[PDB]
Amino acid sequence: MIKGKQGRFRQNLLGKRVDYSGRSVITVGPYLRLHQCGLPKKMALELFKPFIYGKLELRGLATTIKAAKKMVEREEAVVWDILDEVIREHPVLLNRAPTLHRLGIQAFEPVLIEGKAIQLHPLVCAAYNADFDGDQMAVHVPLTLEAQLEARALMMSTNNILSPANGEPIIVPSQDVVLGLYYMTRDCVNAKGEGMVLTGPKEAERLYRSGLASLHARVKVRITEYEKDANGELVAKTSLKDTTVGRAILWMIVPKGLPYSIVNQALGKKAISKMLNTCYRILGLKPTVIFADQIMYTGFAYAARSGASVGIDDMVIPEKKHEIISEAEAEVAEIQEQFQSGLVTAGERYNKVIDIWAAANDRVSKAMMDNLQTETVINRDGQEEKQVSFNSIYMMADSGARGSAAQIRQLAGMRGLMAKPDGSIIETPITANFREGLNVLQYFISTHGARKGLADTALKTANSGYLTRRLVDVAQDLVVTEDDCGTHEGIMMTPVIEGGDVKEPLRDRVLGRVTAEDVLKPGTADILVPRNTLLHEQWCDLLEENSVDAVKVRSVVSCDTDFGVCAHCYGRDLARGHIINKGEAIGVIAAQSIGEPGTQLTMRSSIQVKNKGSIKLSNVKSVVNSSGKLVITSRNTELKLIDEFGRTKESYKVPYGAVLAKGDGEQVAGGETVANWDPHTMPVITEVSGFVRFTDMIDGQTITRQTDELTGLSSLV
Amino acid sequence: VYSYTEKKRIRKDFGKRPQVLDVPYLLSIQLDSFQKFIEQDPEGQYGLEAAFRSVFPIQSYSGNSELQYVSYRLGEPVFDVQECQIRGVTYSAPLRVKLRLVIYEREAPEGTVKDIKEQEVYMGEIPLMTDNGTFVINGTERVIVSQLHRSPGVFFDSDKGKTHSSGKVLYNARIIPYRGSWLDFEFDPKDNLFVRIDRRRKLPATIILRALNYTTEQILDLFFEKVIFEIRDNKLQMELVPERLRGETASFDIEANGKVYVEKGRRITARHIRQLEKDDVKLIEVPVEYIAGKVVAKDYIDESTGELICAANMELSLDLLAKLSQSGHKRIETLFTNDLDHGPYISETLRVDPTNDRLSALVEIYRMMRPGEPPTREAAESLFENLFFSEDRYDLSAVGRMKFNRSLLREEIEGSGILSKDDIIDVMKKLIDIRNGKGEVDDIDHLGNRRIRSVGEMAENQFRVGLVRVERAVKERLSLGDLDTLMPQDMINAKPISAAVKEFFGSSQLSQFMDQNNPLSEITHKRRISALGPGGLTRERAGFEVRDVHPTHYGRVCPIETPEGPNIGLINSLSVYAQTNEYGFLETPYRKVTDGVVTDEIHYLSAIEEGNYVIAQANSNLDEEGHFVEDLVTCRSKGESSLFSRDQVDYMDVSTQQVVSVGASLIPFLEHDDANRALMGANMQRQAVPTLRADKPLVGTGMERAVAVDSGVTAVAKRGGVVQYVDASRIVIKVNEDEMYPGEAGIDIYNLTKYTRSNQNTCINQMPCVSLGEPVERGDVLADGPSTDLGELALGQNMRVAFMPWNGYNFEDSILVSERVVQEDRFTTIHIQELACVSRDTKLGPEEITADIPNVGEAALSKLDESGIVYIGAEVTGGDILVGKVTPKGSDVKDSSLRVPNGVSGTVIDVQVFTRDGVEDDLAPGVLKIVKVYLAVKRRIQPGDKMAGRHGNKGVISKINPIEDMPYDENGTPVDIVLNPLGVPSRMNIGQILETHLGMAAKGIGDKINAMLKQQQEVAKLREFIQRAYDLGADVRQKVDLSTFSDEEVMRLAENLRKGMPIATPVFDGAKEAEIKELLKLGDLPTSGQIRLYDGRTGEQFERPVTVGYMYMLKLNHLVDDKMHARSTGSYSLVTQQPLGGKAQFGGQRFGEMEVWALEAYGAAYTLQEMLTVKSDDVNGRTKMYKNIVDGNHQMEPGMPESFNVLLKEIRSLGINIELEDE
DNA sequence: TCATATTATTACGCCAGACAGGG
DNA sequence: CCCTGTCTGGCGTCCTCTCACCTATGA
RNA sequence: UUGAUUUGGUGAGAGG
Ligand SMILES: [Mg+2]
Ligand SMILES: [Zn+2]
């Protein structure tokens, strides 16, 4: 009765069943503002029975409590006004059933629904991982007054617009709205109203609505962008931008402070995400909430006006696809004719077949990708001119709404080389896509490849959940409890480099973390930033201008606070712009932010330089050989490639005894080989010269005589 | 030629490959298994006769009486199936067994018995199977699901990597009997051979050889070959066959015949072996360092002194050679222990063995098996001689002996059920051979190594359990038997057999409640192959490879119909053409291919036969003779799909449906969908509710007919003929004379099952689809069941669907529906609820059925009689009264009167009452007042329901728009349902678009026929257009013989086609795209499939024309007013003070653990405090809070949770003193 | 009805943690 | 006496919905 | 002072 998953701790004391709670199937309702959700009248009259009883007893309509329970059991004509007067400013906690991180419980204001389904604002769905394929959510009512204020001031859906795991906005517009924007702000080389001039964005929308221009038709407009270059003062600058009609119509919705160049591009999904991010960093919270709603409304409206279907003709088969398959069939015919005559080995045959089918797969993908990305060729006033296509599946791929390169590849080009459950690949690919028919064997190999994926997700989720449990029970205690621990120690944040191009820049690692000692400017001994400044975006831009090497920054593991973490050694709040407040539980949000992506994770010669810069060596003890190539007498030598500015751009590990084509502090060319060794032969190279003696080397007991067969130059083994 | 309901509406059948084998009867697994169980089959195999011939004749321990068997029988069921479902009894039959007791005198093995007696005794009742493959166990209709388990017979498994943490492989070998003790052999990383019995302790394996009366020398004779050292002129020369030197280093000087063959240092090559065989080299003189490591084979004793020189399996040293050389044993037999091939595993196991003779071997085995209790000669010998060698407690069946002889490459396949010495020795030899290198392991997912149990086998095993209990009872009564004063029912007892067989058919992991909401769902729950159950693997443990699809599933198990979630790939569903082998394996049809010409003869194969042959592909182009039109064709050799020549193949696939099952071969354009979305599509297609008006999929596959007939939901005519059609109650069919018996003049009267409850509260209802005075043939359908339309299979309905974003109302997967869908009642399904009321005599007198309902006023006496119980049929809702059922002394009187649950409406369709003999009948005792009331809610469609197509496109219907706001094309018709195009590039289920275009073309032909028949034309133009519609395109199978339809069957066909011409697009040989375009050109529709659509709101054109077509959309039984729930305050549990759980219990939401972590992640300290103290558990806190709310004071007085004090008392009820400290 | 008191299957996969064995 | 196979215990995802089934004995 | 039993526990199936 104590232990286990169903004891008292895990089943009745940590998790309890709860009154004033409800549950139903969700649906969309896109008319909502993002602080409110739809909630049915029947659930609203059941969850709010005591508030309705109190309201009915206040007016004087009834007397005893019984009378009120008969009134709402009968549901007379007067209790719905009582219900709209108990709802009004009273938030509710919506909760999707697998809550993984804190954005899966958010507080809304109810708007009453004729119906039996919770209407949930669409942007908020990307926080809940809630699609609408049969999902269900629970509603909880904050009873007391402190809980209503916590739902409005901490857990309201307008307050959760940044994910706590990072700095990325979580109210990013998901799928229909980015298609509506990508169709709206685009262009074509001829439309109605090509190259006419417009006195404002208002008559741009008036020309689109009356039927005199097109939504994408390039046009000089006169827009007035407000740049706030002073200290909190918005300065108007008006100019003529060569833009389209749709970019002016979308400029009618952008708030004042953002520049016009945030809408001047084509606006896929990454661009609209950084649009909302720059709006949040400049204009704050309230314009970003109202602008997120206006983005969603105009995306839905012009996606409705777009009529962006999907057909069978939209998946354009490459004309070059059949000749590519026949050239691959001729190549496997040559390899198997060598296999009948035994010239090549079996593993080299299998490797050659997988290599030519990978090459033919890449060529088929490039054929279809050219045939989709620039298929439209329309003339304007004369000879033809090409542009990016308005194919429907290509806008669904290029916009980033739904689709990638691989999925649009499998609908038009060949769907690769599927792998059997043995783990090794199958030498005969699936040359037929989905627009052509798969025959029987090809679909069966496909089912191998997809049954493995479904089994992996349905067994992966248990380990992901148990990982989140272990993480929030090791964290469980750690609360921000001071304001400064009073130290000078902290870890040394450098950009990380594996050996390719510089993977994660320093601005991703030292964004919003308080420096340990004051960072010297890279010239000489300057106080560039002081020693306890939070590094927000302005400081990080003044770090990127000066090309700062690495920052000694304060880390949580170096915090000197007994029983908790001080407010500076944590860093930025991450979903609030400022430092972490005294109190906010960081262990639980950290454990959730590590364990929450557990589902997306999977479950089951020499050095060639790439760029062109300067050489530097670390952990090096070296010697010049007879020929001149600086060989190394240390195993653990790090070969860095430093640029002309001071930051470290490349790093490699060079073994004991390697032939370096270059030396210390030298300038090289891009692509020149600078290192060489033999890993199958461990070098026993020296420091000095002289003659060689065999000390304790006796043939017969110590060493042996193995004269070489095919060469004759013997060696004492 | 066609039958007469085939000429009603003949579906346009694409499909190029001529089918050679028609689809077998889809319920044949269940029916053939249970027809094997009950059948009078002489020669004994298989059935109930096998059980009676195993258990009988019973003779007691020399008690001079021997009860023997004659014959058995099953009488009539006392209750036919309908009144059996109504009453609640099992649908069973009494098992009348003739038993003949003969009783001996003293000294009669051969003497004639002194007296006989014989009677038709009664043991148990066995549940018969309904004609559709179901049981009726206790009123409810259940299905036994066929198991998939490991075959009996030896398996050589490896476990190559994980043990020893050193990369050293092991090799174990399990001899799995069908009934009895498990025997496993296994290596250990010291390269020693170990036996274990029934997963017990580990014994070194040669002790079992020493238990079979084998001395050490006989064991070394078995597992080792002898090397002969002859004592000769000098240094004790060696016989050397040159095979033994293969791959080793020459340690000494290899010379003979005055010639140095191979010197020291170089390894012996096979050319040197050829030199020694050409030079005829056997006897060579060895150094003394060569014998100084070898091991003796047999024993040798010093002859004159009379003592032992060396025991068998002893390594040799030089002084041991000085011992044995001087005695006079000239031959020395040594064990050839090759480090490469012939390893010394048995010999080192003999060195591990602490035993020496047979008796100590049996004592050690008895101390392993049964510990504590002493090991004496009789007890240990009886144990080991009945472990494997008696016919009672160890029995490899015929399957087990076939697999056991097949895995050891024996010639025969039939043998005795027990093991022997030679079988255990052969398993050890094959295991050693696998360790040496020759031969390989077996895999467990290979469906030649994986048998199917079915209903007859499982019920026969349970019946054999009951019979061995009743024979132990008969042996009990007979030795205490006094004669002649007993007749054979004081000996025998009907109780244990009935108890065991009702234990299996009631409470087992495979006798389970039938998914009955759909003809598809019935017919695909009966064809189910579960890996679970008794003796099989579990859901929460294993694994990765048994959840995965293996290349022997091609044509035996559906690759794509397996339920997603916790059990994927354990609950496999059987393929369309796959029968079951004689031994229980899965054999699938193939077409025998002797030479170039592919012959139309079929031939069935299992996976241990499919590997040897080369089997072609279903769709490989062959023209007019069977010759493959290419010179190379894709086949598969040994589970490897590869390209072979024109003339090498021995078999071809029969038809191209045969890979998948009957759930996922109803999906048209399957080959264009992804595998994941075909899985989700088939699993949702099982879940469809039957609509009120069944509607004929325009894009089907033609397998709708076989599923709708073979699942017994339609009233298929038994004997052909005409009709009398009284039908209000029953279809009356007059029989044609050729099918009519000479006596029993006879006309067939079919019973239509009208509105009644299914197992999933849906409505199963049959409607006659034949008129009066109309010819029907044998096998034709007469009454359309639930979800059927003229014998086809109509799960959902076909609706006009536009693919576009429409103002956000179809955002993620939502679906936006017109009002024309909800006005026409074209999804308004009918649900039926059974509600029981009983008035049991709990305590303080019996309860009572009277209208004189108390406290409650004239709001009780209303939908009832003048004095009790709901009248018959009104529009009852929630909070009404159905059966007044309240007691006095329970003012102190109360209201238990079964009412209507909260939120439901309906019409009382039926009231059953077999009550306590007095209500003013046939039922069991105990229960007194038994009133069952059948409501029938009619649920329409609403924002929040779930619809889905056949391709995996799920959706929660979001907005129910008016007709005006819909996107209308320029012809004027609104579109019915708007889906979302963004699902289609990601979820790669592109088949729904081809279904959309081809359904658009189907309704294009239907609109064209509706114009030609409404604006009425004489039938020449209709038969010309129908002939053009049925020719249409490439080489197909259908064409039609349309000029023989008598100028009226053209018109009745064209009356049944004016809603759209139905098109069969088969599974993998479906309609190509050019035929879709060509059919869209026959109708007057645009070729692209896309029409320009205007907007109903703004009246102005959508740019970039959108896709409109007809998709067959289904309503799944996840309805929103079965999920909507809310709770403010009501009842809680007993032990804890927290609220109850569920909806049927009016309970609240479990605010689980991760939600508490999410509130801790915010600063919600007060929200969490009321979330676990006031709202949930603390009783003083929640009563003070309810009074504080209704006063108008939102403030909580928290206190301590009650379940924590429950924790304190449960911890404190140990020896633990947990407290609560200082203030 | 009112006290009497427990036996003839096996088929997870790591991963720590404690224990007798032996160079 | 320090490595070492070997054995024994202790984990293994949250939320929800539907249905059926429940110890023998006994003067 | 104006009324009542599932949670308990197993098995099977389903949804996200
Ligand atoms: Mg979903
Ligand atoms: Zn600190």
XYZ file of C-alpha atoms and ligand atoms in Angstrom, chain A residues 482 484-487 554-556 558-561 564-570, ligand 2:
20
model
C 19.688 34.966 -2.981
C 24.510 37.480 -5.240
C 26.632 34.642 -3.924
C 29.655 36.960 -3.975
C 32.153 34.984 -6.049
C 29.045 32.583 -14.032
C 27.620 29.074 -13.938
C 25.149 27.428 -11.591
C 30.009 27.388 -9.205
C 27.358 29.099 -7.076
C 28.395 29.543 -3.464
C 24.864 29.701 -2.073
C 19.812 27.163 -3.464
C 21.176 29.183 -6.382
C 21.819 32.905 -6.252
C 20.138 35.173 -8.754
C 23.246 36.128 -10.718
C 24.777 32.679 -11.105
C 21.626 31.446 -12.815
Zn 26.194 32.032 -6.937
